[PDB]
């Protein structure tokens, strides 16, 4: 059963991948080889060409992603050779460095050895490789509340945060055969951060807001032809709203809208003044302005939606069905100002793809 | 078959309606009466109590409506006695007057005789009782593009618009047995309109925008216990975003965002300036301000979402399942600033309800 799942998934992937690569004639022989290998070993090993194209397909099939136009230029780093925690740490440090690329962000994925018997070889605990800690001790809230449980887990293992609102969490991952994960403090030279200022309102700097340059999702599983790559961190560049309308704005995150309203000099007293809406717009302008000013890649939601329209056209033109999650594709700011809002999307799951998996803590 | 549909729907409705009315014991006798009546006549007639509560239930079950907190105070006008076009016209005029209520809008529905053999007794052509005409002659666009096809149909029947951007369409409806609908110009004394000004920006009046006070949806079918009330116009008061973020903002409607940007004194050149977002916020502030200043009921999307939260709690507290369409419930401005955005809703259809029906023109 488990291996029939593998063979069926392998069949579909190799056929599809090789068609896209103009390698359709090699499918028959390659499947024989794969079938023998599953027979003789219980699994199979992707060629580097398969691995790279599979990761790209997986991005292409990510229903919730507005940035998919650029799927085919994903920079895929093959790290299936890794066996030690030093090698993992160094691969993660390297991913941060090459993806950041001095601000000119490169969409990158580093792929670690896949699950064996559903047994992980490398288990990453971080949600993102770069993220801020969060604390909640006796009524006082510090940092990013979304990081509270991971932060508590790190502090169990002998890490201690400075309890600033922007403590960088350490890298934390466990190796197969180890009982506890290890942690490593991020070298600050690796991590670009951007201070948030506003183009016109000088007082905006009084909020002392900042955010990190590169979102590197490190807790999803990449699945390709029945192989489960549970550890495969990937990054793009930010869409501004992710920072200005969610990370810094949500009541359950940094919750900064009342403070924004005060520095931009409007009252925060009446719903009918639309002060939250006005504060959201200004904070979002500041975020775009700040990233651009520092030379760190970022895209606004209008340009993003325009790019996504092109992805849609490209898919049609290539004869591929389009899939999407409307509820995630619409930006959280002026959604009806984008074309996305005014059409519908088929939310079917197509593989290869990226999937949620259970957290190893909490 | 057709009558088995009717009896099954009647069974479910009478049971449910009478439970809610504390009249559970009368269900058995009432169903016998109904069953005989379908047997003897092919249909049945609602008591006034059933009709009123059914219309209220229908509002309660409208998945796409954020305003449902107030379902139980709907003002139901029973006009099943109507037989002539003068009576229909007068009932429609009356609905406008009593719903408008000098600006203190009353959620109201007027219910006309239901379909007989799927044969309409009264067929209303208007989408809303009050709406602006739209024209598109040889490249030049005037008025509301959404009204183009109905406007063309009216002008076929000998009506002529002044071709202002805000021509009030005439009431247009057809009677059973008539080949053509009739039309009647709206008395302007009946129709409250609001000029759009901004609380701080004096130049905003230069846009000469306005909108009508009361949205009265007149093209949906109310279904109650298997009876099809195809003509049953209903109204609430506006949520500000419907006007500021859609009617006046959409590129396929009045398309005013570039003009808004100019009068509020910002450039409309770069996506990263979020000029569309900023223009949307200011236009939406102006709309709320203008309605409030004139004494015409309106609700902002924050207050609306707060009221909807109470509807949710009320439903749970009453032991009723909640249904909703997330894609319509989220406001088109700052949706993530409402609780709606952060939860999910079951989009199942529960009856009684309001349903789309085919337009009799186009
Ligand atoms: C190149 C720049 C990119 C941009 C601007 C972008 C934009 C976004 C945005 C805005 C979201 C939505 C998050 C939310 O709604 O809060 C998202 C989700 C997602 N993106 Fe992208 N993205 C990019 C690159 C990538 C890459 C390189 C991958 C993987 C190879 C990827 C895969 C995904 C996935 C899987 C999700 C869903 C995450 C989840 O379900 O939690 N994206 N993207
Ligand atoms: C009391 C004030 C009311 C407010 C503020 C309100 C608010 C809204 C809003 C914002 C929409 C969405 C339109 C859109 O997304 O563009 C809507 C849709 C709807 N509302 Fe309400 N509403 C109210 C009263 C009513 C009443 C009295 C009824 C019927 C008895 C009703 C039934 C509906 C229905 C059926 C829709 C869906 C229309 C469609 O599918 O095209 N609402 N409402
Ligand atoms: C690779 C990449 C690039 C980029 N610009 N953005 C992303 C998405 C980042 C991200 C990270 C974390 C999260 C939190 C939940 C995921 N377990 C999210 C999604 C946030 C969200 C929350 C809600 C309530 C709705 C919604 N649509 N989206 C999105 C990935
Ligand atoms: C009774 C009532 C009160 C009130 N405040 N609002 C309404 C809804 C009015 C309305 C009128 C017309 C329409 C146009 C289509 C309906 N055939 C709409 C819905 C507009 C819309 C468009 C799009 C693209 C998405 C969306 N969610 N909603 C909404 C009814
Ligand atoms: Cl993020
Ligand atoms: Cl409307």
Curated annotation (Swiss-Prot), chains A, B:
Its EC number is 1.14.14.47. Its cofactor is heme; (6R)-L-erythro-5,6,7,8-tetrahydrobiopterin. Heme binds at residue 65. GO terms for biological process: nitric oxide biosynthetic process. Keywords: Heme, Iron, Metal-binding, Oxidoreductase. GO terms for molecular function: heme binding; metal ion binding; nitric-oxide synthase activity. It comes from the Bacteria. PROSITE patterns: NOS (PS60001). Tetrahydrobiopterin (H4B). Can also use tetrahydrofolate (THF) in place of tetrahydrobiopterin (H4B) but binds THF with much lower affinity than H4B. Signal peptide: none annotated. InterPro entries: Nitric_oxide_synthase_Oase-su, NOS, NOS_dom_1, NOS_dom_2, NOS_dom_3, NOS_N, NOS_N_sf. It catalyses: 3 reduced [flavodoxin] + 2 L-arginine + 4 O2 = 3 oxidized [flavodoxin] + 2 L-citrulline + 2 nitric oxide + 4 H2O + 5 H(+). It is an enzyme of class 1 (oxidoreductase). It holds the Pfam family NO_synthase. This protein is similar to the oxygenase domain of eukaryotic nitric oxide synthases but lacks the reductase domain which, in eukaryotes, is responsible for transfer of electrons to the ferric heme during nitric oxide synthesis. Homodimer. Catalyzes the production of nitric oxide. Belongs to the NOS family. Bacterial NOS oxygenase subfamily. PANTHER family: NITRIC OXIDE SYNTHASE (PTHR43410:SF1), NITRIC OXIDE SYNTHASE OXYGENASE (PTHR43410). This is Nitric oxide synthase oxygenase. It comes from Bacillus subtilis (strain 168).
């Amino acid at each position: 059963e488990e291996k029939e799942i593998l063979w069926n998934e392998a069949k579909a992937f190799i056929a599809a991948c090789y068609q896209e690569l103009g390698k359709a004639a090699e499918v028959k022989d390659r499947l024989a080889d794969i079938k023998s290998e599953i027979d003789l070993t219980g699994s199979y090993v992707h060629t580097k060409e398969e691995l790279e194209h599979g990761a790209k397909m997986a991005w292409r099939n990510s229903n919730r992603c507005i940035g998919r136009l650029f799927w085919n230029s994903l920079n895929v780093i093959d790290r299936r050779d890794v066996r030690t925690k030093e090698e993992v740490r160094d691969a993660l440090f390297h991913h941060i460095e090459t993806a950041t690329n001095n601000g000119k962000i490169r969409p990158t994925i580093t792929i670690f050895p896949p699950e064996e018997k559903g047994e992980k070889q490398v288990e990453i605990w971080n949600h993102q490789l770069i993220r801020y800690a969060g604390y909640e001790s006796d009524g006082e809230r510090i940092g990013d509340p979304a990081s509270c449980s991971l932060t508590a887990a790190c502090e169990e293992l002998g890490w201690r945060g400075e309890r600033t609102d922007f403590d960088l969490l350490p890298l934390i991952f466990r190796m197969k055969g180890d009982e506890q994960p290890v942690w490593y403090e991020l070298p600050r030279s690796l991590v670009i951060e951007v201070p948030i200022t506003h183009p016109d309102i000088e007082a905006f700097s009084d909020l002392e807001l900042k955010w990190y340059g590169v979102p590197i999702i490190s807790d999803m599983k990449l699945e390709v032809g029945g192989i489960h790559y549970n550890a495969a961190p990937f990054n793009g560049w930010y869409m501004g709203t992710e920072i200005g309308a969610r990370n810094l704005a949500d009541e359950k995150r940094y919750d900064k809208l009342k403070k924004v309203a005060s520095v931009i000099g409007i009252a925060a007293d009446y719903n009918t003044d639309l002060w939250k809406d006005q504060a959201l717009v200004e904070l979002n302008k500041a975020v775009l302005h700040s990233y651009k000013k520092q030379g760190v890649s970022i895209v606004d939601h209008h340009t993003a939606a325009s790019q996504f329209k092109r992805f849609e056209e490209q898919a049609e033109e290539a004869g591929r069905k389009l899939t999407g999650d409307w509820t995630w594709l619409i930006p959280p700011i002026s959604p009806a100002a984008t074309h996305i809002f005014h059409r519908s999307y088929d939310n079917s799951i197509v593989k290869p793809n990226y999937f949620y998996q259970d957290k190893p803590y909490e």
